[PDB]
Structures are given as structure tokens and as C-alpha cells.
Design a protein around this ligand. Structure first.
Ligand SMILES: NCc1[nH]cc(CCC(=O)O)c1CC(=O)O
Ligand SMILES: NCc1[nH]cc(CCC(=O)O)c1CC(=O)O
Ligand SMILES: NCc1[nH]cc(CCC(=O)O)c1CC(=O)O
Ligand SMILES: NCc1[nH]cc(CCC(=O)O)c1CC(=O)O
Ligand SMILES: [Zn+2]
Ligand SMILES: [Zn+2]
Ligand SMILES: [Zn+2]
Lengths: 340, 147, 340, 340
């Protein structure tokens, strides 16, 4: 008869015993290197050039394209729930706005600057972050100014990007986040802020590690910033490029970045860990991209996972990997969940 | 009797099982129990059975508790009863414990280590690549991630 | 009677047991830090100024000096077998071509640029690397412009080398590999590419660690680039110079190199390991030189070793030492071997 | 007309200039981390059980199988030339000597112990090293005692190996070098020496990093120690196994090794470098194996390289990689070369 066999054992080694550290709910909280708080949440906003807008973005569950006149009523509850910061994304829909040099990017009458002014007035305590790029304002849909061949033109690009960033800061943005990924733009932006006497009041949140991938889909729907005549594989880091990512982190830090953003998040947790070592003295931010966000929702609907559970798991993962800030579309949910 | 894991009896039983699989012909054994010090007993068992030189010990050194093991419980019908595995599997926020578990398993004889889940724990894989730099690291794309 | 003695033993220590990790064929593959793939192979090419050339190089078994008109038929099978990249070497044979400043180096009608144009046209998917130096175009046979005393003239040399490199890139080369070993040439080449607006499309593969030795023989036959009035012991690193090699690696990296090459390979595996630590974020390439290559062939003929076996052993050694790319004359063989 | 182009240059950067450190012959010597001296050379000896032997080993140029009665006249000149140490290898040719447990390994009447006694008497100042293994004394040709299945039997093996090592030391060997590569043999050998009260006088030179390869050929001819019924791929490290090699080095050191040997040499220079970091406080020895040695000779005959030149280059390479001792068949040559 097959019976249960038990091998002869040796006395337990103290070094084997780890269980004493997480056998209680409170202990699992104590084991966390960083605890998730409401003030680490950064909610993205898609401001449209139509002040009465409030359009739902198909590929982005529960997220819409808001116009200035609908901002107050939208923000009120969130701010009351503890929202401390937002990241602005402009979505100029009016025809004849987009061009080869992203002129509309810093248009004072544009959605971004209009949004900055509104928020600084209606929600003076909110921290305003502005994404800096040309992709949503270029006729070609690329992040910077191009060469006749269609390839990125570094010099003209960073020159234009620096202007945009300084202009947002001039309008009142507390922080600028260049997501272009073009070589040396951080240095030009920092120098520009210095020359404009705004470097002491403007936080530079660089998307130091932004990889190219299949997770930016839904975003291209909410802001209509899709490439034309190719992909961003030449500026955004290759998914397998750890060395380049590490070099980009060191570069951006050396160029003046006050903090860095890792995008995507979950799919690049190892890069977040690398960043926490290289940029140990700077705040690291995780960006839970549209694709990752939409992926969780899809899986949830399919019953593969539980929304709240996986959201907490994924977000706690960012903190474990070293991040202390999080840009997520789940901000509204967390402002609630963190209360309980 | 209280329902809590019994380390001694557990590793004693697990070691027997692992050695038996190797005796049957398995080239490698991967303990996914996550119970304190099972790697040492399994390695010692293989040594005593004269199979340690032919059996690769692939330890699930870093196995976190989470919401991604669902589908697996359907394919093998191995779902907990009267509680969860939160007392043996590492807490999602537990980086320190994970690092300590990696060092422990390595020191106990593991020939390679497995990180589970994968995608949701890429940072732990990176930690493992430094701590267990001389050993092969394996990623386990779990049912939940796959689904 | 002498009998076999067995000392009293103690229970086996777990820390002693390593055998569990490599007792199976698959395991020995899992133990490899990097696995050899077809796309890591870089095949050198010796383009002659005689379009109908196809001369065999005595000291270089199975290797010849090809002319443009024989390139198509030579490359076809290789590319079909998986060849992804080649490294061009010009061998201008026409008299009155060589001079004191290597004028012919970037001659648009020369073998290198002619080769670039041909390949970009007939094999558009092939990655083109060009070795950058003056040794094969100078009347004196040295790597750079000389002083009246015969000693290397840094300034004029790097100035000329930078021009050559930019010109190859202008012709269409995807990557440039300066093998001159002259102080600070990487910086001038990078700056030159920047000024020519080609730095974003040109990979700079620096021969950061190139030692002087007895293994470059056969090469001097295939390209006729032998020194005149001395040796290269003043620019190429001394075989015992580890400190200088480490300093050269850091220097080249800091000067803009995108990747580095270690030459020779087998005889300098320790330097490859040093490079994998210093230049951890950059791709490291091993160059299996003519002497090493010819040495394996000789030993094989003598029956000392087996060609295929030692080739795999030596090449796997490069990967073990940290390289992820390999320039070897055995490329054709590997394109076959890797299939089985 | 194509003219030589010279790009505009910037003032030379001090950090680019490395040339000032190796522009003179003496400087290239100063750049060496370690200089090659006669006392670092260890000459191998193949003692036969036929006292009047002096047979030439085909696959091993200029090397023979010597009997005790021919040892004096062979050693005299070498010792006079500066030879300070030798490594003994036994080659029992008498029939019925080899068996399943390598009984003859420590046979007092065997070549090794007979050699130790002779040398200690005729050349009292010579340092005697003995290779420790069973391969040359087993009927199966393997390094240790086997299981019925043909697989290595760790326990019985190290038990037998420890006895052999202690016996050689008892006979008068100053140092023992276990080249078996069987898990934990160093610990048993050290413990055995301790129990025999010889640990304070016996240097344990472990072949901590011994890889399996295609370079041990000629050796199997000089000592007739070739495997039977398989290869040594289960005990000797796989060529791609850097992790295992590093673990083996740490293990052997922790087990009592006083020094370590890296075999092969040239083909494993990166491992020598790894060893120089892990075993920084212990002397590292490079073993220029028969295959590597025969390879140099073959290439030399083929005119691919110059014997003396490549020998110096390869041997200086060991020192560069971190070794301070060298076991080489070129010892006789170096005892001459180092004089000039
Ligand atoms: N330069 C645009 C930008 N800045 C931030 C991410 C958006 C992240 C998301 O998809 O939610 C993107 C889109 C892109 O890179 O294509
Ligand atoms: N001890 C069971 C075991 N071993 C491997 C994973 C399966 C991974 C998967 O879900 O695909 C599980 C399930 C569990 O931990 O609940
Ligand atoms: N600057 C020429 C150059 N670039 C690459 C190596 C060729 C490597 C080989 O010999 O195969 C050489 C020859 C030299 O340094 O003498
Ligand atoms: N255990 C035998 C032993 N000890 C040293 C090397 C000899 C090195 C040489 O080939 O010169 C060998 C041979 C082997 O490993 O097959
Ligand atoms: Zn953009
Ligand atoms: Zn040259
Ligand atoms: Zn042996």
C-alpha cells in the first residue's frame, strides 16, 4: 500500500525561518518599503479646445476629453477626495491647428495654457504638471520637428520643446514633463527655465525611461496623437534595451531632471528598480499607461482578476520597485479605496 | 490542528516527494510550496539518495501571493480551504523578504531560481539577477498573467 | 600488499555540490550567460579596386579579395543563410593611390564607398559596418598622419579620420569602426557626425581595446596594410597593458562610442571581461583576428584540435567573457553550424 | 579631383591623451601589472614506471616520458638554468596496474612517489607539486570512483582522492594539486592533511576552475589517461559556465585551497580575471595545456606566428589576467629567454 513517506530531518536552521515576519496583516504592511498614500497619485487630464466638451474616450474606460467649462464640476469632487496633482494633456480638435513645428503646442489660447490658468484660479492648491511634447500638435504626429527624410531633427526639436516647456511654466505650470524622448532635450529645457528665471520654481519631471511598445494604444484615441509615416521606434527605447535605459536615466539626471518617470510601469518594473539605484536621490514616478490600465479592465470584465485587487497589487508593485509617485487613470478609484 | 502550516512535517514530506520524483526519473525538481527551509531538506534528501549530482533543484525562491493564480486553480483544482496562502507566499510589497528568501534558497542548495509571478514582479527578477548572479533565473508567466 | 586506502569522510556539505546544475546537455545550455545566435555574427569583406577581383589570400584560408562585380553572387548565399552584417575593408591596388594623408580612404570611386553603394542597393537589409583607418591608404602604411620624425600626428590624424568616417556614413554606412587607436579620435568622429547630422543614424563601434601583437599577420596580406619604418607599438596597446586598456575603454565610452570592440579576442578574454564591467551598458564585440583564425586552422590540420569544436569553444568563450557581437572569418561556417 | 578632407578640430582634451604612458620600451614594462620571472614557472613531468624510460610523446613536441634513472641528467641543466618547481604526473605502464579504484595512484613503488623520493634527494631545493587524480590509474579512465551506472561516486571518490593526496605529502610532496574536479574534494583533502599533521607544510593548489574542452588531447597521449564509456562533461565545467566557475572558485577557497589553478589558460583568460577578484588573497596559477601548447607549435610551423613571440604574448597574457604562477611546457625555453 502506498503510504506517505517522511524523510529524516535535521533541527530547523534559524536562517531558514522567515515566517515570523509576515504572519499578521499589520506585518505585511510593515514589510512594505513604502506605503501608498493619496498624495502620491497624479491624475491625467485631456483638455479639449472645445470648452463645453465632455466626450468619452472609447479605448479609455471611465475617462473623457474635458473642456474648460466642464473642469470645475469634474475636479471639485476629486479634490475634495484628496487629489493633490494632475498632469495636463492638450487635445486641440479645431482644424488647421496642427502643423510641422507644433506651433499650437504653446498657444496661449490652447487647451493646455487655458487649463493651467483655470486650475490656478479655481483650484489654487492643486499641483499642475504639464506633459511636454509636439506629437499632439504636429501634422505628422511625431514627438519632434522632422527632417525632410522623415527622421527626427534633434536641434530644432529640443529648441522647440524647450520653448514650449518654458511657456507652460510662464503660464503657471508648477512642473514640466517632457515625454518626447529626444536626445538632450532635458538640458535645453533646464537652460531655458534658467534664462526665464523659472528654474527655482519649476520641477522638471523627465520621462527618462520611456520604452516603445504595444501599450500606448488607448492614449492615441484620447489625444489623437498617432504617428504618421512610421513608428517611434527610433526615439523611444527598445523593450530589450536595458543599457540604453540606464544611460538615459543617468543622462537626464545629469541634465537637470528633478525627478524621473518610468513608462510603461508594470511591464517595466525592473527598469524602475534600476532607476531607484541610479537616481537614488531623486523621486521616481511610475506611469500606468492606457494599455496597462485598459488591460486590467479587460481582464476584470473577463473575470480573470478583480479590479480593486489587481489595481492595488500593480500599484503596490510600483512602490516596491522604488517609485514614490504614480500617474494613473485609477486615481479616482484610489481616492476612495485609500479611505477604507 | 489550528490550520497553520507545520514546517517540520511539511518539509519532511516535501523532501520525500521530491526525491521520489527524481527516483522515478525526473531530471529536475521545483518546490513551489514556499515553506521555510524546504530547499535544504530536499537537497539533503537527494544527497542521501545519491541523486544530487543528477538532479537540478529549481526553487521557487520568490513566489508572491496575489490575484494572478486563478486559472491555475481550475486546471489542477488546487485551491485553498479555510484561508489563503498569505502566510507562506510572500506579500506583494515584501521586497526585503523576497531578497532574503533568494539568498536563503541559494545557500540551501538551489541550482536555479524561479520568480513567480513574472511581469508583475520584474523588479524582483532584477534583484534576483544580482543576488543569484551565478545561477540561472527563471520567469514563470502565471495563468493569471497569461489569461 | 598495496591496497586502496579510503580516508574517513564527513557528511557531504550542500555548499560543495555543484553537479546538480550541469549533468544534462540542456543544462549546459542554461548555464550559458549568453547563447550564440546568427545575428551576432559580423563577416569581414575585403573589397578590391578591381571590380572583377576574386583573389585568394594565402595567409587567410577560405577568404578572398572581392571586387564589386563579384559581390552579388558571393553575398547571396550567405544572406540567405542568415547573414545580418558585414565589415568593410578596402584594398586599393591601383598604383599611385596611396599617399601621406590617405587621400584615397574616402575616395567615392574607391572600393569601400563603391561597396557601400552596391550593398545598400542589392542587399538593403544587410547592416553595413566600415572599418575606419588610413593604414591601407597611406604610403607609409601607418594608421594615421605622421610627423617628419615618423611619429604619429594626433591632431592631423583624428582630423583626417573624422572626415573619412563621416564620408562613409554619408555614402550610406550604418556604422563606423575606427581601428586606428589614436588618442581621442572617437570624440572628433562623433562631433563630425553630429555636425553632418548623421549621429542619430550612425553607430560608432570603437576599437577601444586594440593590442599590439603577433596575431595580425594574415591580415596584412589580404589588405596589404603593413607598417613601414617601424611598428604600431606606439599606438596599439602593449599586451601587458591592462591599466591603459581600461583607461582606453572609459575614454572611448565617454567620447561617444555606442559599442566597443576588443581585438584580439581569445588572447584577450580578460580584457573583454574588464570591458563588460566598465562598458556594461554598451554592446561589446569580439574580433577573431586573422592570426587567431589561421592558428585554429593550422592546429586543426595538424590534428591538434577539431575545427568545428574549437571554433565553437573559442566563440562561446567570447560570449562567456561578456561579448554579444562577434566579427569572425568563421561566419560562413557558423551560418551552417547554427542550423543544426 | 578627390582631395584629402580634414574636419575642423577642437583643442585636444587631456583625458584623451594616453600615449604619454607607453611611447618607450621601458614604459611598456612599467605598464605591466606583473613581470614574468623564472620563479613563476612550473614544469610538468611525466614519470613512467620504467626507470630507464625516455620516450617521446608524439602529440607533445619536445616532451617525453621519463623514468627515474633518467631524471637526474634531465633535471640538472634545467635546475641550473633556474627551474624552481615541477608538477608530477605518473604514467604506470606495467600491465595489471590499473583498476576500478585507482589503487596504484599512491603505490609507494609507483612513478609518482618514486619520483618524489628521487627529487627530494637529488634536487633538495626544487619545489615538488603532485597532480592528484585517479584518471591515470583507473581501468575506466575517469577521474574518480564510479557508480555501477558509470556516473561519478562523490563520496567514495573524494575519500580515495584525499588518501592519495595525503600519501603524496607523506612521501615528501610539498604541494598537492587535485585536478579531478569532483564536488568537495578540497575539503576532504585539507581535513586529511590536518589529521596527518601535514596541513602546515602542504600547499593545496586546487584546480578550482577546470573546464571541459578540445584542448586536452596531447595530454591523453603522454599519460594515457583517456575516458572510457563517455566524457568528463559531467565533472569538468562547461565552456560557457561562468557562474559555475565562479561558484567553484569560492567553494574551493572556502574549503581550504591555498592557491588555485585555471585550466585551460589562454582560452579562459576571463575566468583568470574573475579568479583574481574572487580569490584576490590567494596566488592564481595558469595552466598552459597540451592543446594550447601544441596549437602554438603548429601555428608556428605553419608560419602563422613566431614561437618565441607568441609564447611571450600568451604567457604575459596570463600575468595580465591576474596569474602569478604558470604551469607550462615552455618552461625550458623561458629559462633561456628570460636570461636575455
Ligand atoms: N508623447 C506623448 C505621450 N506622453 C505620455 C504617453 C501617454 C501614456 C499613455 O498611453 O497613457 C504618451 C503617448 C506616446 O508615447 O505615444
Ligand atoms: N503550489 C502550486 C503552484 N505551483 C506553481 C503555481 C502555478 C502558477 C500558475 O498559476 O500558472 C502554483 C499555484 C499556486 O501557487 O497557487
Ligand atoms: N587598422 C587596421 C586593422 N583593423 C582591424 C585589424 C584587422 C584584424 C585582423 O588581423 O584580422 C587591423 C589590422 C592591424 O591592426 O594591423
Ligand atoms: N586529471 C588529469 C589532468 N590534470 C591536468 C590536465 C592536463 C593538462 C594538459 O592537457 O596539459 C589533465 C588532463 C585532463 O583533464 O583530461
Ligand atoms: Zn510625444
Ligand atoms: Zn590601421
Ligand atoms: Zn583526472
Amino acid at each position: 500500500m502506498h503510504t506517505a513517506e517522511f524523510l529524516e530531518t535535521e533541527p530547523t536552521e534559524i536562517s531558514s525561518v522567515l515566517a515570523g515576519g509576515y504572519n499578521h496583516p499589520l506585518l505585511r504592511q510593515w514589510q512594505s518599503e513604502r506605503q501608498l498614500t493619496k498624495n502620491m497619485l497624479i491624475f491625467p487630464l485631456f483638455i479639449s479646445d472645445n470648452p463645453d466638451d465632455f466626450t468619452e474616450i472609447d479605448s479609455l474606460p471611465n475617462i473623457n476629453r474635458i473642456g474648460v467649462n466642464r473642469l470645475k464640476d469634474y475636479l471639485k469632487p476629486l479634490v475634495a477626495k484628496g487629489l493633490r496633482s494632475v498632469i495636463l494633456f492638450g487635445v486641440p480638435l479645431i482644424p488647421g491647428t496642427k502643423d510641422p513645428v507644433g506651433t499650437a503646442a504653446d498657444d496661449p489660447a490652447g487647451p493646455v495654457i487655458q487649463g493651467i490658468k483655470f486650475i490656478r484660479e479655481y483650484f489654487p492648491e492643486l499641483y499642475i504638471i504639464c506633459d511636454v511634447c509636439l506629437c499632439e500638435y504636429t501634422s505628422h504626429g511625431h514627438c519632434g520637428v522632422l527632417y525632410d527624410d522623415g527622421t527626427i531633427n534633434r536641434e530644432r526639436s529640443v529648441s522647440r520643446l524647450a520653448a514650449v516647456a518654458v511657456n507652460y511654466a510662464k503660464a503657471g505650470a508648477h512642473c514640466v514633463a517632457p515625454s518626447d524622448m529626444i536626445d538632450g532635450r532635458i538640458r535645453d529645457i533646464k537652460r531655458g527655465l534658467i534664462n526665464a528665471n523659472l528654474a527655482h520654481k519649476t520641477f522638471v519631471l523627465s520621462y527618462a525611461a520611456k520604452f516603445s511598445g504595444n501599450l500606448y494604444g488607448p492614449f492615441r484615441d484620447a489625444a489623437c496623437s498617432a504617428p504618421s509615416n512610421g513608428d517611434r521606434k527610433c526615439y523611444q527605447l527598445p523593450p530589450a534595451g536595458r543599457g540604453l535605459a540606464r544611460r538615459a536615466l543617468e543622462r537626464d539626471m545629469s541634465e537637470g531632471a528633478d525627478g524621473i518617470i518610468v513608462k510603461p510601469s508594470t511591464f517595466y518594473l525592473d527598469i524602475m528598480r534600476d532607476a531607484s539605484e541610479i537616481c537614488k536621490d531623486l523621486p521616481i514616478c511610475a506611469y500606468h499607461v492606457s494599455g496597462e490600465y485598459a488591460m486590467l479592465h479587460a481582464a476584470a470584465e473577463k473575470g480573470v482578476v478583480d479590479l480593486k485587487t489587481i489595481a492595488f497589487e500593480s500599484h503596490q508593485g510600483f512602490l516596491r520597485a522604488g517609485a514614490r509617485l504614480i500617474i494613473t487613470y485609477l486615481a479616482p478609484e484610489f481616492l476612495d479605496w485609500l479611505d477604507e
